[PDB]
Protein backbone atom coordinates (compact mmCIF):
# COMPACT_ATOMS: atom_id res chain seq x y z
CA UNK A 1 0.00 0.00 0.00
CA UNK A 2 1.30 3.77 -0.76
CA UNK A 3 -0.63 7.08 -1.26
CA UNK A 4 -1.78 6.26 -4.75
CA UNK A 5 -3.13 2.69 -4.12
CA UNK A 6 -4.92 4.20 -1.02
CA UNK A 7 -6.25 6.67 -3.06
CA UNK A 8 -7.43 4.98 -5.74
CA UNK A 9 -9.33 2.82 -3.48
CA UNK A 10 -11.46 5.56 -1.87
CA UNK A 11 -11.98 7.22 -5.81
CA UNK A 12 -12.29 4.83 -7.76
CA UNK A 13 -11.44 5.34 -11.78
CA UNK A 14 -13.92 6.40 -13.88
CA UNK A 15 -13.16 7.67 -17.94
CA UNK A 16 -16.58 9.81 -18.16
CA UNK A 17 -17.66 12.70 -16.68
CA UNK A 18 -19.46 11.71 -13.44
CA UNK A 19 -20.99 13.39 -10.03
CA UNK A 20 -19.07 13.18 -6.93
CA UNK A 21 -20.86 12.26 -3.65
CA UNK A 22 -21.26 16.10 -3.28
CA UNK A 23 -23.52 16.23 -6.69
CA UNK A 24 -19.80 17.94 -8.42
CA UNK A 25 -18.81 17.24 -11.84
CA UNK A 26 -15.60 14.87 -11.73
CA UNK A 27 -13.51 12.53 -13.99
CA UNK A 28 -10.68 10.21 -13.66
CA UNK A 29 -9.56 9.21 -10.27
CA UNK A 30 -11.46 11.61 -7.94
CA UNK A 31 -10.54 15.06 -10.08
CA UNK A 32 -12.71 17.60 -9.54
CA UNK A 33 -13.54 19.71 -12.58
CA UNK A 34 -15.84 22.29 -10.98
CA UNK A 35 -18.67 22.85 -8.53
CA UNK A 36 -20.63 25.08 -11.16
CA UNK A 37 -23.88 22.99 -12.46
CA UNK A 38 -23.00 23.68 -16.24
CA UNK A 39 -22.22 20.55 -17.64
CA UNK A 40 -20.60 22.96 -20.00
CA UNK A 41 -18.39 24.23 -18.03
CA UNK A 42 -17.54 21.19 -16.60
CA UNK A 43 -16.75 19.66 -20.26
CA UNK A 44 -14.08 22.93 -20.54
CA UNK A 45 -12.64 22.45 -17.04
CA UNK A 46 -11.94 18.89 -18.32
CA UNK A 47 -10.75 20.16 -21.67
CA UNK A 48 -8.42 22.65 -20.22
CA UNK A 49 -7.38 20.09 -17.60
CA UNK A 50 -6.34 17.66 -20.49
CA UNK A 51 -5.12 19.58 -23.28
CA UNK A 52 -7.06 18.82 -26.01
CA UNK A 53 -11.36 18.44 -26.56
CA UNK A 54 -12.26 15.77 -24.97
CA UNK A 55 -16.52 16.04 -25.38
CA UNK A 56 -16.65 14.45 -21.99
CA UNK A 57 -14.24 11.08 -22.03
CA UNK A 58 -10.78 10.55 -21.03
CA UNK A 59 -8.20 7.35 -21.63
CA UNK A 60 -6.79 5.95 -18.60
CA UNK A 61 -3.27 7.08 -18.94
CA UNK A 62 -4.77 10.88 -18.55
CA UNK A 63 -6.41 9.97 -15.98
CA UNK A 64 -3.81 8.72 -14.21
CA UNK A 65 -1.86 11.89 -15.44
CA UNK A 66 -4.60 13.94 -13.47
CA UNK A 67 -4.21 11.51 -10.31
CA UNK A 68 0.17 11.97 -10.20
CA UNK A 69 -0.94 15.88 -10.26
CA UNK A 70 -3.32 16.29 -8.14
CA UNK A 71 -1.99 14.21 -5.29
CA UNK A 72 1.49 16.26 -5.77
CA UNK A 73 -0.67 19.64 -5.64
CA UNK A 74 -1.98 17.93 -2.30
CA UNK A 75 1.13 17.20 -0.56
CA UNK A 76 3.00 20.24 -1.57
CA UNK A 77 -0.36 22.44 -0.69
CA UNK A 78 0.24 20.50 2.95
CA UNK A 79 3.81 22.18 3.33
CA UNK A 80 2.77 25.39 2.18
CA UNK A 81 0.14 25.69 5.00
CA UNK A 82 1.67 26.89 7.79
CA UNK A 83 -1.09 25.02 10.34
CA UNK A 84 -0.41 22.01 8.47
CA UNK A 85 2.73 21.21 7.91
CA UNK A 86 4.05 21.11 11.45
CA UNK A 87 1.39 18.39 11.78
CA UNK A 88 2.48 16.48 8.79
CA UNK A 89 6.17 16.42 9.73
CA UNK A 90 5.23 15.31 13.28
CA UNK A 91 3.58 11.76 11.51
CA UNK A 92 5.35 8.95 10.01
CA UNK A 93 4.79 7.83 6.38
CA UNK A 94 1.60 5.98 7.02
CA UNK A 95 0.02 8.88 8.83
CA UNK A 96 0.91 10.92 6.70
CA UNK A 97 -0.91 9.14 3.65
CA UNK A 98 -4.41 9.86 5.86
CA UNK A 99 -3.69 13.46 6.17
CA UNK A 100 -3.04 13.69 2.05
CA UNK A 101 -5.92 11.62 1.45
CA UNK A 102 -8.21 13.73 3.38
CA UNK A 103 -6.86 16.83 2.66
CA UNK A 104 -7.20 15.54 -1.54
CA UNK A 105 -11.17 14.68 -0.55
CA UNK A 106 -11.92 17.97 1.44
CA UNK A 107 -9.38 20.44 0.07
CA UNK A 108 -7.43 22.74 2.76
CA UNK A 109 -10.54 24.80 3.53
CA UNK A 110 -13.02 21.80 4.26
CA UNK A 111 -9.62 21.15 6.41
CA UNK A 112 -10.19 24.36 8.54
CA UNK A 113 -12.27 23.07 10.28
CA UNK A 114 -9.67 20.46 11.79
CA UNK A 115 -7.85 22.61 14.65
CA UNK A 116 -8.76 20.20 17.27
CA UNK A 117 -8.30 17.20 15.23
CA UNK A 118 -4.62 18.49 14.18
CA UNK A 119 -3.31 19.40 17.76
CA UNK A 120 -4.42 15.72 19.01
CA UNK A 121 -2.45 14.41 15.80
CA UNK A 122 0.74 16.58 16.59
CA UNK A 123 0.33 15.32 20.57
CA UNK A 124 0.21 11.54 19.27
CA UNK A 125 -3.19 10.83 21.05
CA UNK A 126 -4.66 8.52 18.55
CA UNK A 127 -7.44 7.52 20.03
CA UNK A 128 -8.39 10.45 20.97
CA UNK A 129 -7.61 12.46 17.69
CA UNK A 130 -9.59 9.17 15.99
CA UNK A 131 -12.83 9.91 17.80
CA UNK A 132 -12.12 13.78 17.50
CA UNK A 133 -12.02 12.97 13.18
CA UNK A 134 -15.38 11.48 13.29
CA UNK A 135 -17.57 14.40 15.25
CA UNK A 136 -17.63 16.06 11.33
CA UNK A 137 -19.93 16.75 8.71
CA UNK A 138 -17.11 14.76 6.80
CA UNK A 139 -17.14 11.58 8.77
CA UNK A 140 -21.33 11.50 8.74
CA UNK A 141 -21.33 12.65 5.08
CA UNK A 142 -18.63 9.40 3.59
CA UNK A 143 -18.28 7.51 6.98
CA UNK A 144 -16.98 4.24 5.28
CA UNK A 145 -13.91 6.05 3.54
CA UNK A 146 -13.67 8.51 6.69
CA UNK A 147 -13.78 5.18 9.12
CA UNK A 148 -10.86 3.81 6.87
CA UNK A 149 -8.90 7.05 7.24
CA UNK A 150 -9.48 7.44 10.63
CA UNK A 151 -8.20 3.84 11.43
CA UNK A 152 -5.34 5.19 9.28
CA UNK A 153 -4.75 8.24 11.54
CA UNK A 154 -4.95 5.76 14.70
CA UNK A 155 -3.03 3.00 14.12
CA UNK A 156 -0.34 4.10 11.64
CA UNK A 157 -1.03 0.66 9.88
CA UNK A 158 -2.97 -0.45 6.68
CA UNK A 159 -5.35 -2.46 8.47
CA UNK A 160 -8.29 -0.96 6.55
CA UNK A 161 -6.86 -1.06 3.30
C1 LIG B 1 -6.73 17.35 8.51
C2 LIG B 1 -5.84 16.46 7.67
C3 LIG B 1 -4.38 16.60 8.03
C4 LIG B 1 -3.88 15.87 9.09
C5 LIG B 1 -2.55 15.97 9.45
C6 LIG B 1 -1.71 16.82 8.74
C7 LIG B 1 -2.20 17.55 7.67
C8 LIG B 1 -3.54 17.44 7.32
Redesign the pocket.
Known sequence: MNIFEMLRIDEGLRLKIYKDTEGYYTIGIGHLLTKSPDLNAAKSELDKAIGRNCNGVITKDEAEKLFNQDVDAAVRG?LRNAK?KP??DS?DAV??C??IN??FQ?GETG?AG?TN??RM?QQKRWDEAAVNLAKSRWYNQTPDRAKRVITT?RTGTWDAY
Do not use: H, K
Open positions: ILVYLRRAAQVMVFSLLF
